[PDB]
Design an enzyme around this catalytic site. Structure first.
Site, PDB file in Angstrom:
ATOM      1  N   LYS A 189       0.819  -1.204   0.000  1.00 55.68           N
ATOM      2  CA  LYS A 189       0.000   0.000   0.000  1.00 55.68           C
ATOM      3  C   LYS A 189       0.853   1.253   0.000  1.00 55.68           C
ATOM      4  O   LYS A 189       1.722   1.413   0.847  1.00 55.68           O
ATOM      5  CB  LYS A 189      -0.908   0.001   1.221  1.00 55.68           C
ATOM      6  CG  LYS A 189      -1.776   1.243   1.324  1.00 55.68           C
ATOM      7  CD  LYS A 189      -3.080   0.989   2.081  1.00 55.68           C
ATOM      8  CE  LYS A 189      -2.935   1.080   3.574  1.00 55.68           C
ATOM      9  NZ  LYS A 189      -4.212   1.589   4.135  1.00 55.68           N
TER      10      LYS A 189
ATOM     11  N   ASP B 141      -7.988  -2.373   8.687  1.00 55.51           N
ATOM     12  CA  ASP B 141      -8.562  -1.018   8.544  1.00 55.51           C
ATOM     13  C   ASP B 141      -9.273  -0.448   9.769  1.00 55.51           C
ATOM     14  O   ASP B 141     -10.504  -0.383   9.808  1.00 55.51           O
ATOM     15  CB  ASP B 141      -9.542  -0.970   7.354  1.00 55.51           C
ATOM     16  CG  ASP B 141      -8.841  -0.954   6.013  1.00 55.51           C
ATOM     17  OD1 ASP B 141      -7.715  -0.430   5.919  1.00 55.51           O
ATOM     18  OD2 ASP B 141      -9.430  -1.465   5.039  1.00 55.51           O
TER      19      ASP B 141
HETATM   20  O1  LIG Z   1      -5.348  -9.372   1.207  1.00 57.01           O
HETATM   21  N1  LIG Z   1      -5.237  -7.992   1.543  1.00 57.01           N
HETATM   22  C1  LIG Z   1      -4.199  -7.620   2.294  1.00 57.01           C
HETATM   23  C2  LIG Z   1      -4.024  -6.294   2.682  1.00 57.01           C
HETATM   24  C3  LIG Z   1      -4.941  -5.329   2.274  1.00 57.01           C
HETATM   25  C4  LIG Z   1      -4.843  -3.981   2.627  1.00 57.01           C
HETATM   26  C5  LIG Z   1      -3.717  -3.450   3.424  1.00 57.01           C
HETATM   27  C6  LIG Z   1      -3.846  -2.935   4.701  1.00 57.01           C
HETATM   28  C7  LIG Z   1      -2.708  -2.442   5.338  1.00 57.01           C
HETATM   29  C8  LIG Z   1      -1.472  -2.450   4.690  1.00 57.01           C
HETATM   30  F1  LIG Z   1      -0.361  -1.988   5.270  1.00 57.01           F
HETATM   31  C9  LIG Z   1      -1.361  -2.947   3.418  1.00 57.01           C
HETATM   32  C10 LIG Z   1      -2.485  -3.436   2.800  1.00 57.01           C
HETATM   33  F2  LIG Z   1      -2.350  -3.920   1.564  1.00 57.01           F
HETATM   34  C11 LIG Z   1      -5.797  -3.077   2.153  1.00 57.01           C
HETATM   35  C12 LIG Z   1      -6.848  -3.530   1.354  1.00 57.01           C
HETATM   36  C13 LIG Z   1      -7.899  -2.608   0.874  1.00 57.01           C
HETATM   37  C14 LIG Z   1      -8.688  -3.241  -0.276  1.00 57.01           C
HETATM   38  C15 LIG Z   1      -9.946  -2.443  -0.615  1.00 57.01           C
HETATM   39  N2  LIG Z   1     -10.726  -2.168   0.578  1.00 57.01           N
HETATM   40  C16 LIG Z   1     -10.085  -1.623   1.759  1.00 57.01           C
HETATM   41  C17 LIG Z   1      -8.792  -2.358   2.086  1.00 57.01           C
HETATM   42  N3  LIG Z   1      -6.933  -4.845   1.052  1.00 57.01           N
HETATM   43  C18 LIG Z   1      -6.013  -5.744   1.481  1.00 57.01           C
HETATM   44  C19 LIG Z   1      -6.156  -7.091   1.135  1.00 57.01           C
HETATM   45  C20 LIG Z   1      -7.288  -7.479   0.244  1.00 57.01           C
HETATM   46  C21 LIG Z   1      -8.597  -7.603   0.646  1.00 57.01           C
HETATM   47 CL1  LIG Z   1      -9.033  -7.331   2.346  1.00 57.01          CL
HETATM   48  C22 LIG Z   1      -9.586  -7.954  -0.259  1.00 57.01           C
HETATM   49  C23 LIG Z   1      -9.266  -8.168  -1.593  1.00 57.01           C
HETATM   50  C24 LIG Z   1      -7.953  -8.030  -2.009  1.00 57.01           C
HETATM   51  C25 LIG Z   1      -6.970  -7.679  -1.094  1.00 57.01           C
HETATM   52 CL2  LIG Z   1      -5.268  -7.498  -1.659  1.00 57.01          CL
END
Ligand SMILES: [O-][n+]1ccc2c(-c3ccc(F)cc3F)cc(C3CCNCC3)nc2c1-c1c(Cl)cccc1Cl
Length: 342
Positions: free
Chosen positions: A45, A160
């Site tokens: 991110k 989050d």
């Molecule tokens: O696995 N994964 C890992 C981390 C995240 C993060 C996320 C949160 C904190 C960080 F330091 C780095 C990050 F990438 C933020 C979001 C954002 C995605 C859109 N909505 C808000 C959070 N999605 C994901 C996800 C994810 C989710 Cl929860 C659903 C579908 C695809 C992903 Cl790559």
């Protein structure tokens, strides 16, 4: 030390990351990627304009500090945080790296009456993560399915926190269906149990396969809520420390707590019992994450020697006014001081 970074424009924005990370693909600004050093696929991110303002400078610090403190199987952690900058003088980018999970509850439950064994495994993880979170006196404030990352093994990681609007919380929207009423309607300065209420909405939803309190606005939702759980008694009334909130509640025509066994038909009595104990109006009397992990409903998953607490979290920065530069330096210190886990 210092690794070698490389550029790639990725959907409108340039990402500059260490060589180890490869095969970045868009997702949201977030990317899937693969970390050659550790073999883990990861989410990455980039904070957009991390130090655009005082509110934003503080925000990035808050986030990075929070991610830095979290170390638990059910809570979003930092494998890595980095900047391509070589000094504070041009420091202006933070990249936050975490495990890749791939979906959230929404993209897996979603109008879908799950099996009881599943619903246990999902909530146990939430509560285990919440016992760890609440133990560092941190609150999430905004629990809901979209802030719970699940991978294809049913492994949940809480995501989050409520780090930061009025339009984003208005009308028939899931941005507000999991919020404890005491905070939806700003009744009082609120405990951490606000999260336990949200778990209770989530749980009901996973069993029933329908949104528990899908109100068309704040007052329609309160009405849906009070109907299920009773209108408040005089004891809770004194605690609502906001003459206008009290007055409005007082207007409401009194009514008693519904029977949950009749709302959740054919649901496991243990779960119904738990819901009874989560969905309570007086935040003071709700079940805690700790106490709930000891509930019978999770007897097949309860292990009181594998339910860690945290170290303490010094959030005294919150009540502290500072300049952009002073937050950014506090932030820089956090980035360059980082240590990755084993
Ligand atoms: O696995 N994964 C890992 C981390 C995240 C993060 C996320 C949160 C904190 C960080 F330091 C780095 C990050 F990438 C933020 C979001 C954002 C995605 C859109 N909505 C808000 C959070 N999605 C994901 C996800 C994810 C989710 Cl929860 C659903 C579908 C695809 C992903 Cl790559």
């Amino acid at each position: 030390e210092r690794p070698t970074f490389y550029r790639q424009e990725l959907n409108k924005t340039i990402w500059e990351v260490p060589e180890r990370y490869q095969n970045l693909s868009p997702v949201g600004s977030v990317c899937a990627a693969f970390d050659t050093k550790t073999g883990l696929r990861v989410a990455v991110k980039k904070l957009s304009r991390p130090f655009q303002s005082i509110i934003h400078a503080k925000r990035t610090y808050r986030e990075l500090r929070l991610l830095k403190h979290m170390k638990h199987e059910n809570v979003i952690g930092l494998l890595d945080v980095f900047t391509p900058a070589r000094s504070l003088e041009e420091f202006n980018d933070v990249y936050l790296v975490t495990h890749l999970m791939g979906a959230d509850l929404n993209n897996i439950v979603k109008c879908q009456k799950l099996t009881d064994d599943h619903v246990q495994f999902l909530i146990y993880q939430i509560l285990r993560g919440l016992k760890y979170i609440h133990s560092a006196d941190i609150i999430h404030r905004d629990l809901k399915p979209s802030n719970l990352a699940v991978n294809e093994d049913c492994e949940l990681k809480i995501l989050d926190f409520g780090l930061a609007t009025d339009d984003e919380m208005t009308g028939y929207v899931a941005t507000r269906w999991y919020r404890a009423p005491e905070i939806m309607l700003n009744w009082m300065h609120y405990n951490q149990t606000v999260d336990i209420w949200s778990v209770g909405c989530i749980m009901a939803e996973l069993l029933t396969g329908r949104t528990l309190f899908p109100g068309t606005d704040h007052i329609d939702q309160l009405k849906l809520i009070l109907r299920l759980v009773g209108t408040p008694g005089a004891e809770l009334l004194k605690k609502i420390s906001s003459e206008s909130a009290r007055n409005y509640i007082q207007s409401l025509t009194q009514m008693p707590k519904m029977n949950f066994a009749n709302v959740f038909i054919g649901a496991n009595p243990l779960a119904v019992d738990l819901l009874e104990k989560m969905l309570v109006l007086d935040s003071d009397k709700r079940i805690t994450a700790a106490q709930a992990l000891a509930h019978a409903y999770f007897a097949q998953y309860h292990d009181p020697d594998d339910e860690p607490v945290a170290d303490p979290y010094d959030q005294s920065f919150e009540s502290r006014d500072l300049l952009i530069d002073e937050w950014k330096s506090l932030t820089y210190d956090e980035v360059i001081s980082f240590v990755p886990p084993p």
